[PDB]
C-alpha cells in the first residue's frame, strides 16, 4: 500500500510547500511506510532539482510516466559541439557572455543552441528558423539528455502545439493551444498509452486519468497543491481516498473568519468537501477556524509541516564585534522585506556594525536592491539569494525577523528556533502565535507596528544576556516539534484515516 503526496513540481529553488512534501517523505521513510512524491507539470529539469533532497525512486512525474522516462537516470554525456562541427560540418558562432551558439550551414542561419553550463555538457534548448528567420520550432532537452518537447510557433512566437517524446524519439503526447487574454491555454491533449490513443480537453482531465493509472486498492493520496490537485481529485471516483492539506490561510480576509470568501487556490477543494477523508492544516488555531467554517462536514486535524532534528553544525558561535540579523523569506510582497531594510536604516545610527542577511528569491529582488542602493546600505544589507543548506548561516545569527502578513506555519521560524536563533515576528495567523511565547524564545509584536519592531529588536541588541536567554528558550520550543513527535502524529493519522 503506497502513500502518494501530489504537488505540482520542484523548482530550482524550493518553495515552502515543496519543502513540506519532502519533510513528510523523510518522516514516512524513517517510520518505514512507503511514500512517493507525485509531480504533475512538465519539468525537464525535475531530475536535477530533486537531486539535493530526494531519490529518483522517491517520485513519479506525470509527463515522465507517459514519456516512459519514469525512474530513468542521466545519460552518458554527449558532445553536441563536436557532433555539429565534426559530424554535421556546420560552423558555430559563440554568442558573447552566454552558453549559446548560432549554427550555420551553406551560408544560412539554421539554429540557435543554448547550454545550461560553461563546459557545454548540458544542451537546454535549440531554436529552428525558416528561410526568412521565423522561429518555427523550439526543441527542449531534458537535463538527462533526451529531447523532451518540440513546440511549434505561429506569429509573434505564440505557442500553437507541443509534441512530447520518449527518450527514443517516439511521440507520446500532443497538446493544442489557443490564446485567451494574451496567454496560451490547452484546448486538446492526445496521449498514446497502452497501444491506445486518449483524448482530453485540459491538464485536469489528464491528471484525473494519471491518478486512476497509479491507484491500487489500499493506496492513499494527499492533495498538496490544491489549485491543481483538487480539480483533478473532483474527477476521480470517491473510492480513491484523498486528504486535503492546506499550506496557508484559507480565506482572502483572515479578519472575517465567518464571511470572507475562500482563497481562489482552495475554492475547488471547499466546494466539494465530502470528496476528502479529512483536511490537514499546520496549526491548532487554523484547525479550530476551519472546522467552525465548514460546520464539521469532515474531520480537521493539525500536523505541523516542519520538525526539528538535533543539529550537527555549530550553534550560537557569535562574532562579538558585529551583530548578524537574518530573514529567511521569499523576495515577495506579503513578506514585506522593505520594512526590514527600513528597520536597518534606523538601527545603523545606534549599531554601526549591524548586518541583515536576507536569504530567498523572487520578483521583489530588483525593487529591494534599488531600496538598499538608495539608502547606501550596501555594506549592512545583503540579498544573499537562495542557499540549499542554511546550516552554517544560522551558526552566527543573533535574531530572525518575520514581517509577513500571512503564514501557514513558517518553516523558517521553526528552523531558526531549532538552530538556537530567537525570532521577532508580527503576531499574525497562522504559525508565529503558536511558535513564539513572548519573552521566552522571541517576541510577538502587532501586525505592521514598525515602531514596536525597532524597540524590541534594539532592546535585544542592547542586552546580549537576553539574546542568550531567548536562545535557550528557542532550542526548548523546537524540542516540542521533534522528528519523534511528528512521526507519532503521522503514524496515528495513517492508521485511522481509511475506513476499516
Amino acid at each position: 500500500a503506497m502513500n502518494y503526496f501530489v504537488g505540482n513540481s520542484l523548482g530550482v529553488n524550493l518553495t515552502g510547500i515543496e519543502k513540506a512534501i519532502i519533510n513528510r517523505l523523510n518522516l514516512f521513510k524513517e517510520m518505514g511506510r512507503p511514500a512517493q512524491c507525485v509531480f504533475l507539470s512538465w519539468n525537464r529539469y525535475l531530475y536535477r532539482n530533486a537531486q539535493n533532497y530526494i531519490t529518483s525512486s522517491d517520485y513519479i512525474n506525470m509527463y515522465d510516466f507517459f514519456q516512459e522516462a519514469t525512474y530513468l537516470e542521466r545519460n552518458e554525456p554527449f558532445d553536441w559541439l563536436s557532433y555539429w562541427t565534426d559530424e554535421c560540418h556546420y560552423t558555430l558562432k559563440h554568442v558573447e557572455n552566454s552558453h549559446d551558439f548560432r549554427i550555420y550551414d551553406q551560408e544560412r542561419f539554421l539554429m540557435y543552441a543554448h547550454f545550461q553550463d560553461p563546459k557545454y555538457r548540458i544542451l537546454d534548448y535549440v531554436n529552428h528558423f525558416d528561410s526568412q528567420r521565423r522561429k518555427v520550432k523550439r526543441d527542449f532537452y531534458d537535463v538527462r539528455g533526451f529531447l523532451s518537447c518540440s513546440r511549434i510557433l505561429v506569429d509573434k512566437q505564440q505557442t500553437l502545439c507541443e509534441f512530447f517524446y520518449n527518450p527514443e524519439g517516439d511521440t507520446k503526447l500532443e497538446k493544442y493551444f489557443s490564446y485567451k487574454d494574451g496567454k496560451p491555454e490547452v484546448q486538446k491533449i492526445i496521449v498514446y498509452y497502452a497501444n491506445k490513443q486518449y483524448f482530453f480537453n485540459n491538464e485536469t482531465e489528464l491528471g484525473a486519468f494519471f491518478i486512476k493509472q497509479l491507484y491500487q486498492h489500499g493506496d492513499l493520496f494527499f492533495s498538496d497543491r490544491n489549485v491543481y490537485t483538487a480539480p483533478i481529485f473532483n474527477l476521480t471516483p470517491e473510492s480513491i481516498p484523498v486528504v486535503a492539506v492546506l499550506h496557508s490561510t484559507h480565506i482572502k480576509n483572515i479578519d472575517a473568519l465567518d464571511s470572507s470568501p475562500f482563497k481562489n487556490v482552495y475554492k475547488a477543494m471547499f466546494e466539494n468537501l465530502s470528496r476528502y477523508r479529512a483536511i490537514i492544516v499546520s496549526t491548532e488555531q487554523q484547525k479550530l477556524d476551519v472546522e467552525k467554517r465548514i460546520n464539521h462536514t469532515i474531520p480537521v486535524v493539525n500536523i505541523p509541516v516542519g520538525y526539528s532534528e538535533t543539529i550537527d553544525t555549530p550553534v550560537q558561535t557569535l562574532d562579538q564585534r558585529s551583530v548578524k540579523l537574518i530573514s529567511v523569506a521569499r523576495y515577495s510582497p506579503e513578506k514585506q522585506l522593505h520594512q526590514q531594510i527600513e528597520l536597518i536604516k534606523r538601527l545603523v545610527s545606534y549599531v554601526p556594525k549591524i548586518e541583515l542577511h536576507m536569504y530567498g528569491f523572487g520578483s521583489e529582488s530588483k525593487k529591494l536592491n534599488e531600496l538598499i542602493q538608495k539608502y547606501g546600505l550596501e555594506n549592512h544589507v545583503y540579498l544573499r539569494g537562495f542557499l540549499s543548506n542554511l546550516d552554517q548561516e544560522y551558526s552566527d545569527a543573533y535574531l530572525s525577523l518575520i514581517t509577513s502578513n500571512m503564514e501557514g506555519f513558517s518553516l523558517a521560524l521553526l528552523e531558526s528556533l531549532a538552530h538556537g536563533v530567537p525570532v521577532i515576528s508580527y503576531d499574525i495567523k497562522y504559525g508565529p502565535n503558536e511558535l513564539i511565547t513572548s519573552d521566552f524564545n522571541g517576541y510577538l509584536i502587532t501586525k505592521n507596528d514598525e515602531d514596536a519592531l525597532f524597540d524590541k529588536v534594539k532592546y535585544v541588541i542592547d542586552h546580549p544576556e537576553v539574546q542568550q536567554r531567548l536562545s535557550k528558550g528557542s532550542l526548548a520550543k523546537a524540542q516540542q516539534y521533534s522528528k519523534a513527535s511528528l512521526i507519532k502524529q503521522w503514524d496515528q493519522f495513517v492508521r485511522l484515516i481509511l475506513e476499516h
Partner: peptide, 6 residues
C-alpha cells in the same frame, strides 16, 4: 537578431 534566442 534579438528575437533569435529566448
Amino acid at each position: 537578431s534579438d528575437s533569435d534566442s529566448d
